[PDB]
């Protein structure tokens, strides 16, 4: 009964193949882990010194307190803070990589890279206060890259990728509570210090530190999107496909998996050059497909089809047709390196700090990107040749996907209804009830939740209640694989008011039809695009973000990055649903801060709800409360 | 049977008082924690994503692998790496605080602070390559503080507080393996990234990252010592006392506890001004005493007596005579805030990122240090008044302590035997066998080990075998409280060869007697002083550190900081004993790297040995192997 594992039919088909072939999957490893430790599940475990491990019984008798005296409050808050810091370390490390790549490009040290989006470069410079008049583009970009790198450490200004991206009124609220980050890596290190043994031991103080570190994560996300748009182009609407049926038995199938477009973007361009080399090997060409966020990056910019996402990533290999899986970092199940010996896939790592035992490592250097890409793709071609005559089982299952909804693209689409006040048509339809509010779906799948079940269940209820739904990361992946990015499904999925708006915008954009039911705003760093849209709406309305009828849902969250994103969503003022249990329930005081008293600090708050129908009701109630606070009908 | 808890008689006496008074201690909380989790003890637990908690059975059947596919190797190495990063975050955060204090002082923004050690300032500038000729001291110091802050982030040079403090041959070895840190907070963040889910998953690669992050920790330690010496004076030999008998019933007893001399040094100076204000309240004066590293800082510089250390810190409060405990950060059991309601002690926090629920917080700002110190001390005076007429139980137990052996002071002492080649008398006596080798004792006590039993057992065996013993942190605390810093105990404790050398040096220093059996080199950051001494010996000999008969022992380690120090001791080339089990035994491959194959990378290696007699034998064997490698008798 594979429907309990994934709601995606293509994944179900590959689970049947993996089972008959004896290939262990993430779901099998989860089953073998049950029952999981109740101390860890509730957050009541600490290993922060060698007197541990310490634990606290959720209920009953001793142990009641850690060996050093750490209470349940402290232990829970310290663990949570470390998870936020780890997420911030990932999103911002990605951004740092892109900042160094941009610097190299404009210094003449990496000619495979360039300023592709001159408009984005100039806007970012203007947002940061960097002068552009009479300056060469390469000098403007050098100053932007320098500013990006400076935000990682203390200096005479706070993190500009926070203070220049949120409205002044929100910055003032955050500053009053000491929550503006001083430097991205500075805050990460301060979290690791304050949570080490014998340091911070006050739950409120620890959690305020966590909120501030979550804003360091936001800055890394926003910096990542800004720099990737400069280097690779700001997305605009594009049509493609998703799910395993995008693999082609007669092509060299190459998955790009991981996170950074510095790698996946070059793979895409070089693969086109090597088409004739692929044909010589008996393929039709090189079919690049996406997994996880780096797949989202090349889908959003180039229309590269998405193969799969998150928890089901091993299933692409089980088809037998995946000739290469090209990795950089984050969210890659290390099982891929062993499964590859059963499936024939060549798994290739490329980043010095992210290797997997048993995978081939091909160092990638931006200074040699094209040559390193050809080396990698030639391994894929050789692998295609090795499977000559082997049957493959690619599920013949795919959906149509309209994506590429950057904030610039959303504003442009709306400008066709109101050229000089593009946000007004959206606001008009929020006021008249055709749009009840906005919900951002973000984050991962998680093996504890039947894959995609929370995303689709919640999305369907919100869409029927006229909520404008936007999505990023593997939430966008879930929704695309279930048809939520195909405009042909607007009639079935959308309430009448929402359908009217999607249709009006689409017809003004010449489509003869509507925008898709859900707007794909990109990768996990591109949650920063949703911030840009929400901040622009707040600024246009003259209100702070905690008065807007906008919510977020990390409906199947997994990674430390998703915890960090959820936390900065709360910190900027949003009601934020999480559909899995974070390790907080072992402390009622911590849970009460994160779900209730934080409202009095930032206006946002977590909504912890594992039942998706109930979560949808709670998200609708949060939206409707905001509408009432603005004096609107609901 | 309190001897199973601590070998310190004063601690035993206070344990009896705490038991009859019903005051729960760290030992009681440990007992309540037993049996501790075997997954955590062995390192085979992972909570790095919300699919967890994951665990791996050390032996037997499933679970055998984490849900994402993470092996035991990966899980163990990732946990270890996070501990190193957390330690680095603490030592280097301390150093960053001091760098900002020095900058403020010389900019005229904090007149309670100043350049006290002009000689140290100029030497550091010369070591770093900063010009001094024709420059004002305040400008030289501004450049030193700027250089310190720059080492936290990437720049055009690597971390100078690594590359300028180790010999070029060692830097070359480390560079060849990619182990030189690029920036202190940069490496901390990169560890948190690479150890997050779906990133680095190769044990060797992860551990190389850990070694590099341990060098970021070394840089933070060395920077902390350098800056504290500039601001507060480089230590020189001083005579004082240790143990609870240094408390005085008729004085206002104030403990400084935590880490940074930016706080404890001002408390010491202001307390002297407030003597008459204390007498008005009926005290004889203010008796400042030390706990943990900040106590070591003021002991080394000012001869402030040490009250207690590490695991036994609560016992100072149990006397009933501790009027205030002034805290900044690190290694403070948060139980102190609750015990204070039973003992009457005023526990005061002072740093924004290190608060304890139930303790009074008095913000300390360097710009207002004197006024903030008087506010704090007036709380202590009021507390002294409240205990008028209450009996106290101060154990009448103390030892004499000769300390203050900075590397400068050791070189000066040796220069009395050879003025222009001060290291030669030490080397001469290593060659002739009067000194078998050198052992650094470092790190914490740990409730799992009867307090001080490993430090004293190992030290006694090494001293009888003519090993020169140096000590820092709570290893120095253990040895001082058991008489190892009293020169009257040289005859009892030291082998004939070592006694001869300690006597020759002491008599050349006008003492009419020997140096003490163990040389106190200061706080935990002052492990960097041992590096300076060992690097100077290596440079004088023309060999790398991994050929010297020098070892280290973290005989009762606890904190993540101690893991980081142990790891950089291995990385710079030392055989390094740890006397508690770090969470590594669940992976034989990881254990084999850390105890064996790392020898081929750095020349150092861990010696994991919980039995102290056996650990002493293993340390002696390591020393003697080094002697043989140099062609010396042993
Ligand atoms: S920090 Fe405290 S609670 Fe955590 S392992 Fe150490 S003694 Fe236990
Ligand atoms: S990172 Fe892997 S091993 Fe760790 S909790 Fe997540 S699924 Fe389990
Ligand atoms: S790329 Fe990773 S952070 Fe979550 S959204 Fe997808 S599993
Ligand atoms: S101050 Fe702390 S790091 Fe260990 S050496 Fe003492 S318990
Ligand atoms: S006791 Fe299971 S997570 Fe630590
Ligand atoms: S299962 Fe006990 S430390 Fe996690
Ligand atoms: Fe992602
Ligand atoms: Fe210390
Ligand atoms: Ni994500
Ligand atoms: Ni220490």
Burial (CB < 10 A; 0-12, 13-18, 19+), residue B40, is buried
- Please give the residue of chain B at the shortest CA–CA distance from A42: B53
**Torsion sign (Cα): B422, B425, B430, B435:** negative
Is A82 within 8 Å of B82 when comparing Cβ atoms?
yes
User: A240: which strand partners?
Assistant: A401
Burial (CB < 10 A; 0-12, 13-18, 19+), residue A19, is middle
**Domains parsed from chain B with CATH numbers:** 61-235 (1.20.1270.30), 236-404 (3.40.50.2030), 407-634 (3.40.50.2030)
- Please give the residue of chain A at the shortest CA–CA distance from B146: A155
Atom from ligand 1 closest to the CA of residue A75: 3
Non-local (6+) Cβ contacts of A485 within 8 A are A242, A399, A400, A401, A402, A403, A476, A479, A516, A517, A518, A520
Strands (E), A227-337: 238-242, 252-257, 286-291, 306-308, 322-327
Strand order in the sheet with B550-554: B518-522, B468-472, B438-441, B550-554, B575-578, B605-608
Distance CA A163, CA B504 (A): 64
Distance CA A232, CA A229 (A): 5
* Three-state SS annotation for A222-257: HHHHHHHHHHHCCCCCEEEEECHHHCCCCCEEEEEE
Distances (CA, A) of A13 to A245, A393, B515: 12, 9, 78
Is B53 within 8 Å of A37 when comparing Cβ atoms?
yes
Q: Ligand 7 being an ion, which residues bring their Cβ within 5 A of it?
A: A 293, 524
Q: The tokens 């810093």 sit on which residue?
A: B485
Interface mutation target, options B155, B193, B340, chain A, most CBs of A under 10 Å:
B193
Non-local (6+) Cβ contacts of B66 within 8 A are A29, A33, B46, B52, B54, B56, B74, B75
* Three-state SS annotation for B231-253: HHCCCCCEEEEECHHHCCCCCEE
Tell me, using a 6 A CB cutoff, whether residue B68 lines ligand 2. Answer: yes
- Give the distance from residue A310's alpha carbon to the nearest chain B alpha carbon, in angstroms: 10
Distance CA A374, CA A273 (A): 9
* Residue A235 structure tokens: 């997305």
Cβ proximity of A161 and A148 under 8 Å: yes
- Strand B54-55 to B238-242 pairing: unpaired
Q: Which helix (H) or strand (E) holds A52?
A: none
- Strand B346-349 to B322-327 pairing: parallel
Residue of A5, A4, A15, A3 whose CA lies nearest to A395: A15
Size of interface A-B (CB pairs under 8 A): 328
* Residue B286 structure tokens: 């203010």
Q: What are the helix (H) ranges across B469-597?
A: 473-481, 490-493, 496-508, 527-541, 560-571, 588-592
* Residue B423 structure tokens: 């290291």
Residues of chain A found within 8 Å of residue B205, distances taken between Cβ atoms: 352-353, 355
Atom from ligand 6 closest to the CA of residue A45: 3
Cβ proximity of A247 and A253 under 8 Å: yes
* Residue A321 structure tokens: 């047709």
Non-local (6+) Cβ contacts of B332 within 8 A are A198, A199, B257, B258, B292, B313, B354, B356
Distance CA A400, CA A241 (A): 5
* Residue A414 structure tokens: 């709306």
- Give the distance from residue B391's alpha carbon to the nearest chain A alpha carbon, in angstroms: 27
Distance CA A202, CA A188 (A): 19
The SS3 assignment for A431 reads helix
Is A199 within 8 Å of B90 when comparing Cβ atoms?
yes
Residue of A518, A530, A450, A511 whose CA lies nearest to A483: A518
CA angle A590, A596, A602 (to 5 degrees): 100
- Comparing CB atoms, the residue among B49, B337, B357 nearest residue A559 is B49
Tell me, using a 6 A CB cutoff, whether residue A522 lines ligand 3. Answer: no
Tell whether residue A49 is among the known ligand binding residues: yes
Residues of chain A found within 8 Å of residue B23, distances taken between Cβ atoms: none
Residue of A162, A159, A165, A195 whose CA lies nearest to A86: A195
Q: Which of residues 154-193 of B touch A (CB under 8 A)?
A: 154, 178, 183-186, 188-193
Concatenating the DSSP letter of every residue in A379-409 gives HHHHHHHHTTT---------EEEEE---HHH
Is B53 within 8 Å of A71 when comparing Cβ atoms?
no
Task: Report the Cα–Cα distance between both ends of chain A, in Å, rounded.
Answer: 41
The SS3 assignment for A426 reads helix
Phi-psi region of A287 (alpha: psi -120 to 50; beta: other; left: phi over 0): beta
Non-local (6+) Cβ contacts of B514 within 8 A are B487, B490, B499, B502, B503, B505, B506, B507
Residues of chain A found within 8 Å of residue B582, distances taken between Cβ atoms: 50
Q: Which helix (H) or strand (E) holds A566?
A: helix A560-571
Residue A219 sits at φ, ψ, to 5 deg, of -60, -40
Cβ proximity of B316 and B255 under 8 Å: yes
Cβ proximity of B313 and B481 under 8 Å: no
* Residue A367 structure tokens: 């200074």
CA angle A605, A606, A612 (to 5 degrees): 135
* Residue A102 structure tokens: 């941009």
Radius of gyration for chain B, computed over Cα atoms and rounded to the nearest angstrom: 24
Q: The tokens 């005051």 sit on which residue?
A: B23
Q: Which helix (H) or strand (E) holds A551?
A: strand A550-554
- Comparing CB atoms, the residue among B89, B334, B446 nearest residue A50 is B446
Q: Which helix (H) or strand (E) holds A553?
A: strand A550-554
Mutating to test ligand 3, I would choose from A90, A330, A471, A474 the residue with most ligand atoms within 8 A of its C-beta, which is A474
The SS3 assignment for A434 reads coil
Non-local (6+) Cβ contacts of A632 within 8 A are A430, A431, A433, A549
The SS3 assignment for B397 reads coil
Residue A334: nearest ligand to its CA?
Answer: 2
Cβ proximity of A165 and A220 under 8 Å: no
Distances (CA, A) of A580 to A31, A444, A445, B608, B612: 17, 11, 10, 40, 47
* Residue B561 structure tokens: 């900081």
Distance CA B54, CA B70 (A): 9
User: A290: which strand partners?
Assistant: A256, A306
Residue A566 sits at the chain B interface (C-beta within 8 Å): no
User: A356: which strand partners?
Assistant: B201
Cα A268 versus chain centre, distance: 21
Cα A460 versus chain centre, distance: 21
Residue of A376, A275, A399 whose CA lies nearest to A328: A376
Q: Which of residues 93-152 of A touch B (CB under 8 A)?
A: 93, 149, 152
Residue of B49, B473, B403 whose CA lies nearest to B221: B473
Distance CA A575, CA B259 (A): 40
Concatenating the DSSP letter of every residue in B564-613 gives HHHHHHHHTT-EEEESS--TTTT-HHHHHIIIIITHHHHS-EEEE--SHH
Distance CA B216, CA B156 (A): 17
* Residue B21 structure tokens: 């008074």
Distance CA A460, CA A454 (A): 10
Residues of chain B by 3-state class (helix, strand, coil), percent to 5: 55, 10, 35
Residue of B612, B615, B584, B6 whose CA lies nearest to B308: B6
Q: How many CB atoms lie within 10 A of CB B390?
A: 10
Residue B64 sits at the chain A interface (C-beta within 8 Å): yes
Tell me, using a 6 A CB cutoff, whether residue A197 lines ligand 1. Answer: yes
The SS3 assignment for B395 reads coil
Q: How many CB atoms lie within 10 A of CB B341?
A: 10
CA atoms within 13 A on the CB side of A562: 33
Cβ proximity of B90 and B216 under 8 Å: no
- Comparing CB atoms, the residue among A52, A62, A192 nearest residue B86 is A192
User: A576: which strand partners?
Assistant: A552, A606
The SS3 assignment for B137 reads helix
Q: The tokens 């370390």 sit on which residue?
A: A89
Distance CA A618, CA A24 (A): 37
The SS3 assignment for A554 reads strand
Residues of chain B found within 8 Å of residue A90, distances taken between Cβ atoms: 192-193, 196, 199
B/e letters for B461-485, b = 16+ CB within 10 Å, e = fewer, are bbbebbbbbbbbbbbbbbbbbbbbb
Residue of A328, A93, A145, A331 whose CA lies nearest to B187: A93
Distances (CA, A) of A335 to A314, A338, A359, B96, B422: 8, 5, 10, 40, 58
Radius of gyration for chain A, computed over Cα atoms and rounded to the nearest angstrom: 24
Cβ proximity of B473 and B524 under 8 Å: yes
Is B69 within 8 Å of A336 when comparing Cβ atoms?
yes
Mutating to test ligand 1, I would choose from A40, A50, A51 the residue with most ligand atoms within 8 A of its C-beta, which is A51
- Strand B54-55 to B45-46 pairing: antiparallel
Residue of A212, A293, A225 whose CA lies nearest to A570: A212
> Resolution to 1 decimal, in Å?
1.3
Q: How many CB atoms lie within 10 A of CB B16?
A: 13
Q: The tokens 């960090």 sit on which residue?
A: A564
Non-local (6+) Cβ contacts of A228 within 8 A are A98, A261, A297, A525
- Strand B238-242 to B399-403 pairing: antiparallel
Residues of chain B found within 8 Å of residue A190, distances taken between Cβ atoms: 89, 93, 353
Strands (E), B216-316: 238-242, 252-257, 286-291, 306-308
């Amino acid at each position: 009964r594979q429907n309990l594992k994934s709601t995606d039919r293509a994944v179900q088909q590959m689970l049947d193949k993996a089972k008959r072939e004896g290939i262990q999957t993430v779901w099998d490893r989860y089953e073998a882990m049950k029952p999981q430790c109740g101390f860890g599940e509730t957050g009541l475990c600490c290993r922060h010194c060698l007197q541990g491990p310490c634990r606290i019984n959720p209920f009953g008798d001793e142990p009641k307190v850690g060996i050093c005296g750490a209470t349940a409050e402290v232990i829970v808050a310290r663990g949570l803070d470390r998870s936020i810091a780890a997420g911030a370390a990932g999103h911002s490390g990605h951004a740092k990589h892109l900042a160094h790549t941009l610097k190299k490009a404009v210094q003449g040290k990496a000619a495979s890279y360039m300023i592709k989006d001159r408009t984005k470069l100039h806007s970012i410079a203007k947002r940061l206060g960097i002068p552009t008049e009479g300056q060469k583009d390469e000098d403007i970009a050098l100053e932007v890259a320098k500013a990006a790198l400076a935000d990682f450490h203390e200096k005479d200004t706070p993190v500009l990728w926070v203070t220049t991206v949120l409205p002044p009124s929100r910055v003032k609220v955050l500053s009053a509570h000491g929550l503006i980050p001083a430097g991205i890596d500075h805050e990460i290190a301060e979290i690791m210090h304050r949570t080490s043994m014998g340091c911070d031991a006050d739950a409120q103080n620890l959690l305020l530190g966590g909120l501030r570190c979550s804003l360091a994560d936001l800055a890394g996300c926003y910096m990542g999107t800004d720099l990737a748009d400069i280097l690779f182009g700001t997305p605009a609407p594009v049509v493609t496909e998703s799910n395993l049926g995008v693999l082609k038995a007669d092509a060299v199938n190459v998955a790009v998996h991981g996170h950074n477009p510095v790698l996946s973007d070059i793979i895409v361009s070089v693969s086109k050059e090597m088409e004739n080399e692929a044909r010589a090997a008996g393929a039709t060409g090189i079919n690049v497909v996406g997994i996880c966020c780096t797949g989202n990056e090349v889908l959003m910019r180039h229309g590269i089809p998405a193969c799969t996402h998150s928890v089901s990533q091993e299933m692409a290999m089980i088809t037998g047709a995946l000739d290469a899986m090209i990795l950089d970092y984050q969210c890659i199940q290390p099982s891929v390196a062993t499964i590859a010996e059963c499936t024939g896939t060549t798994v290739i790592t490329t980043m010095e700090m992210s290797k997997i035992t048993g995978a081939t490592h091909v160092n990638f250097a931006e200074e040699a990107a094209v040559e390193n890409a050809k080396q990698i793709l030639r391994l894929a071609i050789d692998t295609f040749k090795r499977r000559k005559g082997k049957p493959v089982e690619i599920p013949n299952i795919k959906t149509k996907v309209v994506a590429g909804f950057s904030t610039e693209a959303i504003i442009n689409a709306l400008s066709k209804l109101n050229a000089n006040d593009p946000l007004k048509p959206l606001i008009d339809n929020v006021v008249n009830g055709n749009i009840r509010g906005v919900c951002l779906f973000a984050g991962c799948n998680n093996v504890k939740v039947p894959q995609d079940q929370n995303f689709t269940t919640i999305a369907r209820k919100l869409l029927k209640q006229n909520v404008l739904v936007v999505a990023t990361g593997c939430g966008a992946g879930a929704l695309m694989r279930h048809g939520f990015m195909d405009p042909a499904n607007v009639d079935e999925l959308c309430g009448d008011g929402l359908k009217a708006v999607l249709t009006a915008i689409g017809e003004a954009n010449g489509l003869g039809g509507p925008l898709p039911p859900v707007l794909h705003m990109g990768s996990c760093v591109d949650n920063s695009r949703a911030v840009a849209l929400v901040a622009a709406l707040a600024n246009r309305l003259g209100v702070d973000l905690d008065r807007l009828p906008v919510v977020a849902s990390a409906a199947e969250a997994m990674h430390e990055k998703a915890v960090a994103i959820g936390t900065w969503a709360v910190t900027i003022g949003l009601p934020t649903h999480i559909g899995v249990l974070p390790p907080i329930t072992g402390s009622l005081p911590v849970t009460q801060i994160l779900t209730s008293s934080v409202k009095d600090i930032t206006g946002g708050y977590f909504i912890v709800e594992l039942d998706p129908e109930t979560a949808a009701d709670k998200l609708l109630a949060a939206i409707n409360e905001r509408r009432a606070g603005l004096g609107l009908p609901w």
